[PDB]
Structure formats: structure tokens, C-alpha cells
């Protein structure tokens, strides 16, 4: 009383350091009660849960009064009087309050006369949106550089191609989030082989 599946097309996305937005598809057009749908959100790093109900006519709600860099878990129910059947759990992070940490586990390997494989890692829960491999010829050539901007955090390594042989490069790796970029650090060293 009353059993009904939850709405697919369920989206939970951050919209600020303190709010996340949840959306879903339009309603079942067969009957309503008054019809309502309810949503539950809980913190992972803390113990705080809030219960909300919003009229069935809508397709989104805006969780509020959250904290930055905190992960939350949400589920939702189609309810009559009411006893709907629960959605699956959705995970999302508020956007960060701080600059993201530098990438770590930086590894430079497989250097040839024109290429080199670089890999790294980044920490979760900082709303990091992209990684950028930047490189330039060592020193006095501080007039031009290449940036590889990887917007897919699922990626952890890239093969740099089209490098000049027997040449020395400084390589930097930044992470970018809503607040800004990695605090700059010392560049890595990379020396390509001569042409064989």
C-alpha cells in the first residue's frame, strides 16, 4: 500500500558546495492519490539523513544544506499512502571547498626518440574534473608548451607522441576542480633518445 517501481532516468549531480540536484522521468499516467514521491539522502563521512517529499507532478529536487567535499547517498520512492518500492542507491559528491591535490604516483617510462608513457593517480571526492599533462623544452625555451587536457578521470595514463629526439623536457601534471588547479610543484625530467 502501495507498491510501484521507482522512476528510472534518475540523475544525482552536484550543483554547488552545498547542494545536489536529483532528476527523473515523468510520472505513470494511470491514477494518483494525491500522488507523491519521496527521497532520502544520507552522509557517508557523517551520520545525517534527511527525508523529503515533493509532489509527483515534478521531475527534480534540489538537496540543500550539505557540506563541501562530502559524499552522500540518495534513494527515492513512488508513494501513494504510501509504501512505494525503493530506488537503487545513487552516489555523488558536493563540489569541493578547496583546490584539488596534485596528482600522485607519477610514472614516466618507455621513452623513445619521440614518445613516452606517463601515468598518475588522483584522489576521489575533490570534484576533480580534468587532468592536464603540460610539457616544454628544458629551460631557456620558456616561450611555448603543449597541454594534453584529459577530461575523463577514468583515465590514468597517456602516451605522449610527437616529441623531438635527443631533447630534454620539463613535464608537469595538474588537476583541475571547481575551485582551481593543482598547486604547482617541481616539474619532472624527461630526455628523449636519439633517432635510431
Amino acid at each position: 500500500m502501495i507498491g510501484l517501481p521507482p522512476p528510472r532516468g534518475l540523475n544525482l549531480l552536484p550543483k554547488s558546495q552545498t547542494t545536489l540536484n536529483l532528476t527523473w522521468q515523468p510520472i505513470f499516467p494511470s491514477s494518483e492519490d494525491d500522488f507523491y514521491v519521496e527521497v532520502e539522502r544520507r552522509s557517508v563521512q557523517k551520520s545525517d539523513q534527511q527525508n523529503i517529499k515533493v509532489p509527483g507532478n515534478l521531475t527534480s529536487v534540489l538537496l540543500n544544506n550539505l557540506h563541501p567535499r562530502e559524499q552522500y547517498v540518495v534513494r527515492a520512492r513512488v508513494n501513494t499512502k504510501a509504501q512505494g518500492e525503493w530506488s537503487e542507491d545513487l552516489t555523488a559528491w558536493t563540489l569541493s571547498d578547496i583546490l584539488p591535490p596534485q596528482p600522485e604516483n607519477i610514472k614516466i617510462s618507455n621513452i623513445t626518440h619521440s614518445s613516452a608513457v606517463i601515468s598518475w593517480t588522483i584522489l576521489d571526492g575533490y570534484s576533480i574534473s580534468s587532468i592536464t599533462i603540460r610539457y616544454k623544452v628544458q629551460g631557456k625555451n620558456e616561450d611555448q608548451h603543449v597541454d594534453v587536457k584529459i577530461k575523463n578521470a577514468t583515465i590514468t595514463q597517456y602516451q605522449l607522441k610527437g616529441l623531438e629526439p635527443e631533447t630534454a623536457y620539463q613535464v608537469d601534471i595538474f588537476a583541475e576542480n571547481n575551485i582551481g588547479s593543482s598547486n604547482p610543484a617541481f616539474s619532472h625530467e624527461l630526455v628523449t633518445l636519439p633517432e635510431s
Epitope: 600522485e104 604516483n105 635527443e166 625530467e189 633518445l193
Partner: antibody
């Protein structure tokens, strides 16, 4: 300030393996290759191999294939080199040095194999 | 294994003299070479990176250069603290290999 800390000396009994340590501080330990180098007293230098602390991949001078084992301990940011069945030929100073291109060096550990 | 023939193995010079050390590579190594300095107490320090780049904080009188298979460390005007040992090192191919070194001493 980058710092690679190696003990000054180790006495080693012939045949008993020894594990040399190189403690890294002042930088991201898992973001740089670590090299090991051997120097016999009054002699030249010899590259043993290197290891990347991120996943412990190692490349070794085949001359040392059956002599040295490189490992790391991430939690203490220490790199180790173990020498197996040491003989008098293994007495020497062993250095560790950070980065693909050795941009910081430890002070070296003098290993003396003697009964 | 690439061989680095470093000459001379020993060199006597005066304060304020200018001297050059040379390594010759048995095969092509490009710019993949460092110059190292060793103090009498065993301390090792990189002076030149990648054939010609002067490391931060190394006095300007040190410079590195190349010509073909020949690589040279030049000290433009010797200071009392420069009379130590020097090594080159190639890392173009594994295993990396060192020159045999140069011991500088003061001529009197």
C-alpha cells in the same frame, strides 16, 4: 628539500644477505624512479638498477640479476636493496639516487663483507 | 653495454686555470648524459644534466657541451674546492654506464 637517508656503514658476514635502506623525505616518494649504484673504494661507479615505488616495477643491470633485489616500503617511504650471498667482491659503497636522471643522491652505505 | 671513455683519468692544474674533461661514447647516446662531482668524503652531486643544462645552484664556471660522440665538462677558472673527482654517466641505453672518472689535483 629533497633528502635521501642511507646508513653510513654495514658490516656483513660472508654469505649472509644484507638489506640496505634509503629513506626518502621532502618529496613524493611514489612519483620518482629510484636508482642504486655501486662503487668499490678508489674505483669507478656501476649502475645496479632502478625501481619505481608506485608499483615496484624494476629494471636491473643483468650483471646484478642474481645479486640484488630491489623493493620499496610505501608506508615508510623507504627503498631497499638486498644483496644475496655476499662475498668480498660485494664490499663497496652503495648509493641510491632519485629520478630517471639522478637529481638527488644519498650519502652512500659502505658495505664491508668480512668474517 | 655502451662504453664511456673518459679522459684524462688524472689531471694536475692550477688555481684559476681552465680545464676540460671529455667522455667519448661507444655508440650514439644523443644528449642522454650527466656530469657528476664526487667529494673526498664520498658525497656525489649532479652538476650538468642532459649534456648541457647547469643544475640549480651549481656555480656558473661549470658548463657542459658536446661534439659528435665527444662530451666535455669545462671548468672556466678553477677554485680550490673543484679539485675533486668527476664522472660522466650515460642513460641512453640500459644498463647505464659511467665514465671511468677524472681525479683533479693541485699543481705546485
Amino acid at each position: 628539500q629533497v633528502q635521501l637517508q642511507q646508513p653510513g656503514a654495514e658490516l656483513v658476514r660472508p654469505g649472509a644477505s644484507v638489506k640496505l635502506s634509503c629513506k626518502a623525505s621532502g618529496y613524493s616518494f611514489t612519483s620518482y624512479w629510484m636508482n642504486w649504484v655501486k662503487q668499490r673504494p678508489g674505483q669507478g661507479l656501476e649502475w645496479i638498477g632502478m625501481i619505481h615505488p608506485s608499483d615496484s616495477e624494476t629494471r636491473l643491470n643483468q650483471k646484478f640479476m642474481d645479486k640484488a633485489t630491489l623493493t620499496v616500503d610505501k608506508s615508510s617511504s623507504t627503498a631497499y636493496m638486498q644483496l644475496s650471498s655476499p662475498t668480498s667482491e660485494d664490499s663497496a659503497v652503495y648509493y641510491c639516487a632519485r629520478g630517471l636522471y639522478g637529481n638527488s643522491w644519498g650519502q652512500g652505505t659502505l658495505v664491508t663483507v668480512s668474517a | 653495454d655502451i662504453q664511456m671513455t673518459q679522459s684524462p683519468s688524472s689531471l694536475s692544474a692550477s688555481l684559476g686555470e681552465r680545464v676540460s674533461l671529455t667522455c667519448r661514447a661507444s655508440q650514439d647516446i644523443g644528449i642522454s648524459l650527466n656530469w657528476l662531482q664526487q667529494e673526498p668524503d664520498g658525497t656525489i652531486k649532479r652538476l650538468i644534466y642532459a649534456t648541457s643544462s647547469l643544475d640549480s645552484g651549481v656555480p656558473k664556471r661549470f658548463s657542459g657541451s658536446r661534439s659528435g660522440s665527444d662530451y666535455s665538462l669545462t671548468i672556466s677558472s678553477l677554485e680550490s674546492e673543484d679539485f675533486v673527482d668527476y664522472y660522466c654517466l650515460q642513460y641512453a641505453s640500459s644498463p647505464y654506464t659511467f665514465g671511468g672518472g677524472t681525479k683533479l689535483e693541485i699543481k705546485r
